[PDB]
Design an enzyme around this catalytic site. Structure first.
Site, short mmCIF file in Angstrom:
data_model
loop_
_atom_site.label_atom_id
_atom_site.label_comp_id
_atom_site.label_asym_id
_atom_site.label_seq_id
_atom_site.Cartn_x
_atom_site.Cartn_y
_atom_site.Cartn_z
N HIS A 41 -29.91 -35.94 31.09
CA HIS A 41 -29.06 -35.29 29.96
C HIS A 41 -29.71 -35.94 28.75
O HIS A 41 -28.81 -35.45 27.70
CB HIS A 41 -27.91 -35.38 30.29
CG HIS A 41 -27.11 -36.68 30.18
ND1 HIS A 41 -26.58 -37.43 29.01
CD2 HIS A 41 -26.68 -37.41 31.14
CE1 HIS A 41 -26.15 -38.53 29.28
NE2 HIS A 41 -26.15 -38.63 30.50
N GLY A 143 -22.86 -43.74 25.03
CA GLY A 143 -23.86 -44.24 24.79
C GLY A 143 -24.37 -44.97 26.11
O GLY A 143 -25.42 -45.86 26.05
N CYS A 145 -24.72 -44.58 29.27
CA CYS A 145 -25.70 -43.73 30.27
C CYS A 145 -27.12 -44.35 30.55
O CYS A 145 -27.86 -44.77 29.33
CB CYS A 145 -25.67 -42.21 30.13
SG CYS A 145 -24.14 -41.41 30.59
C1 LIG Z 1 -23.62 -41.39 28.98
N1 LIG Z 1 -24.08 -42.00 27.59
C2 LIG Z 1 -22.04 -41.09 28.87
C3 LIG Z 1 -21.04 -42.02 29.28
C4 LIG Z 1 -19.54 -41.51 29.36
C5 LIG Z 1 -19.18 -41.15 27.92
C6 LIG Z 1 -17.79 -41.92 27.63
N2 LIG Z 1 -17.66 -42.72 29.19
C7 LIG Z 1 -18.57 -42.56 29.99
O1 LIG Z 1 -18.85 -43.00 30.96
N3 LIG Z 1 -22.05 -39.78 29.75
C8 LIG Z 1 -21.47 -38.71 29.36
O2 LIG Z 1 -21.02 -38.24 28.20
C9 LIG Z 1 -21.38 -37.51 30.53
C10 LIG Z 1 -22.47 -36.54 30.70
C11 LIG Z 1 -22.20 -35.21 29.95
C12 LIG Z 1 -20.58 -35.16 29.76
N4 LIG Z 1 -20.13 -36.89 30.27
C13 LIG Z 1 -18.82 -36.86 30.50
O3 LIG Z 1 -18.68 -38.12 31.15
C14 LIG Z 1 -17.67 -35.76 30.41
N5 LIG Z 1 -17.06 -36.00 31.60
C15 LIG Z 1 -16.91 -34.69 32.23
O4 LIG Z 1 -17.27 -33.84 31.78
C16 LIG Z 1 -16.12 -34.79 33.67
F1 LIG Z 1 -14.94 -34.04 33.62
F2 LIG Z 1 -16.89 -33.84 34.54
F3 LIG Z 1 -15.97 -35.95 34.12
C17 LIG Z 1 -16.87 -36.21 29.10
C18 LIG Z 1 -15.60 -35.35 29.04
C19 LIG Z 1 -17.61 -36.02 27.93
C20 LIG Z 1 -16.47 -37.79 29.09
C21 LIG Z 1 -22.99 -35.20 31.23
C22 LIG Z 1 -24.46 -34.57 30.81
C23 LIG Z 1 -22.11 -34.82 32.46
#
Ligand SMILES: *C(=N)[C@H](C[C@@H]1CCNC1=O)NC(=O)[C@@H]1[C@@H]2[C@H](CN1C(=O)[C@@H](NC(=O)C(F)(F)F)C(C)(C)C)C2(C)C
Ligand SMILES: *C(=N)[C@H](C[C@@H]1CCNC1=O)NC(=O)[C@@H]1[C@@H]2[C@H](CN1C(=O)[C@@H](NC(=O)C(F)(F)F)C(C)(C)C)C2(C)C
Lengths: 306, 306
Positions: A41, A143, A145
């Site tokens: 992503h 950030g 990930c």
């Molecule tokens: C990577 N950089 C981030 C780390 C996240 C951000 C805040 N705490 C973390 O662990 N990963 C993401 O933002 C991922 C990613 C899109 C959205 N996301 C989420 O974690 C979202 N969670 C969900 O959609 C749910 F409900 F399925 F857990 C969010 C609402 C933004 C926290 C992708 C591609 C899944």
């Protein structure tokens, strides 16, 4: 003496972390030989993440759409391919600090260290366990990930986790280094939830052995039990069944302390039924299930790594 | 999302750890520039440690009585001197992996990461705090002496601790990198004991702010209090006085959460008087005092290091 949640030394993994930038999105990547691994992503905008078609988004990008930063050195991307939920970027320079390494998929109840990273720079290290519901109770911000989980075996880094997302209730989900998610989750921003969690019973017993090793032995009784009798009590308290394989895993701790596994099971059964009566074990008021039996052996016997 | 006891990445410190051997005694050393720092009792036998005269024991040793192993490379010792309880060995080769570094002495209540080492090889990393009684609740086995505690500021490693001994009750004692012990302890195998410990009040409040940041907010009440009124209640529970300096330290967390420091003090006062009523905060059944306010900011805002 003493007992803490101990992580593996992270230096070998630190030398592999890079920053991956695609357009405006930035996250971390793992640089091994001439390939950088990162969550797919990275190619999404904020709008894309709500319902992405990763194959379609990757079509419209060339090698020049990815910028990899390793320290003050930019690496030229000369190839790219998608493997499940991880993106693989071939670069013109192989990482000279590539340690001996292996990609593994861990089982629920096993532990690993996490090197939390932002913009390609290591920020902190902590120990986690793969929960029975295939989540981890991590600590991640925006950030993060591309941060990886790993275990060290002497000189070999076994990579087992890459971070992708956080779920409701604040638990985290991710993939192995082949891009396959742990659990039924998908890398899409849509409502998902983990199943009910369970207490890792074999890890509690290993933690109880650690308490005895450190002289904390008030919970030891004079009774024994059978595996069947203990497991019946454990199920009512949402504790996982203890198998013969778990008993064999616990063997080294039984040999070091001179306490039979089933005798320790009798102590845990009493604790589950009667509570802790206001007392603590290893400074904790709750039973702890994120130390594997090998973690206890390693910390209470001192295995090092080079 | 989430909150854990997080250590600094240890790679910078890993490249400085060496094995120091004097006769039959072995422990860890810190190799910075062309000097290796290690506990002075490396020159003791088991009998010597009961009542050692370190100056007399060091007299009878030359540079050739010390063997320093760095990986597969042996370093020639070309000088040696004693500074308080640490021994300093000059070697013919300066460490090319010497990071930018500083020697600091920390205050009680401040935290640091420990790189536990055996035979010069890093084994694990964990976070600790300097207790008000000048001990640390560490995890150390035989041969761990020479392991160091440190904090990272961007690219600079601030060394603040070297491990020397474990005390009754299983707590640990050591020195700064100038060889001066934290607390009234001496490096002799004779009965010693730490004073009564205290709960680091400012760290509890920082941890309470971390709970609110992560959505765990059942303990917040509608009341405020004065610093005098809160401190009177805190003393009865063996909690340290909260000073205006502590309030200023807590300012960033108050600004991020929108909760005044004294309003959070009202919540802590209620928790101390009435207990937790069977509930948990951040998964813990006890109040936690080993996160400084900067640790909370760093973990809940994501500061990285290179
Ligand atoms: C990577 N950089 C981030 C780390 C996240 C951000 C805040 N705490 C973390 O662990 N990963 C993401 O933002 C991922 C990613 C899109 C959205 N996301 C989420 O974690 C979202 N969670 C969900 O959609 C749910 F409900 F399925 F857990 C969010 C609402 C933004 C926290 C992708 C591609 C899944
Ligand atoms: C360094 N390699 C060891 C680390 C110890 C060993 C087990 N857990 C640890 O933290 N340091 C020592 O063995 C030091 C050292 C002599 C003896 N010692 C002790 O920790 C002893 N403790 C005490 O004498 C007391 F009571 F003061 F705490 C021991 C009884 C061996 C545990 C010297 C030079 C003080």
């Amino acid at each position: 003496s003493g007992f803490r949640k101990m992580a593996f030394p992270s230096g070998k993994v630190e030398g592999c972390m890079v920053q991956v930038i695609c357009g405006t999105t930035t996250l971390n990547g793992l640089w091994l030989d001439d390939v950088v691994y990162c969550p797919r992503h990275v190619i999404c905008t904020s709008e894309d993440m709500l319902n992405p078609n990763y194959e379609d988004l990757l079509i419209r990008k060339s090698n020049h759409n990815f910028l990899v930063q390793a320290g003050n050195v930019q690496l030229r991307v000369i190839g790219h391919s998608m493997q499940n939920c991880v993106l693989k970027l071939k670069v013109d320079t192989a990482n000279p600090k590539t340690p001996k390494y292996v990609f593994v998929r861990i089982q629920p109840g096993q532990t690993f260290s996490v090197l939390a990273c932002y913009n390609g720079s290591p920020s902190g290290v902590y120990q986690c366990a793969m929960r029975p519901n295939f989540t981890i109770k991590g600590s991640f911000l925006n950030g993060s990930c591309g941060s990886v989980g790993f275990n060290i075996d002497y000189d070999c880094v076994s990579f087992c986790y890459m971070h992708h997302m956080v779920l409701p209730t604040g638990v985290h989900a991710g993939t192995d280094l082949e891009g396959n998610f742990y659990g039924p989750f998908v890398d899409r921003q849509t409502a998902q939830a983990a199943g009910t969690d369970t207490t890792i019973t074999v890890n509690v017993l290993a933690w109880l052995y650690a308490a005895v090793i450190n002289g904390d032995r008030w919970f030891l009784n004079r009774f024994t039990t059978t595996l069947n009798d203990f497991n019946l009590v454990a199920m009512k308290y949402n504790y996982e069944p203890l198998t013969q394989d778990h008993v064999d895993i616990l063997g080294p701790l039984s040999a070091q302390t001179g306490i039979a596994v089933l005798d320790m099971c009798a102590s845990l059964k009493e604790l589950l039924q009667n509570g802790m009566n206001g007392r603590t074990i290893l400074g904790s008021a709750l039973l702890e299930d994120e130390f594997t039996p090998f973690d206890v052996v390693r910390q209470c016997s001192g295995v090092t790594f080079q």
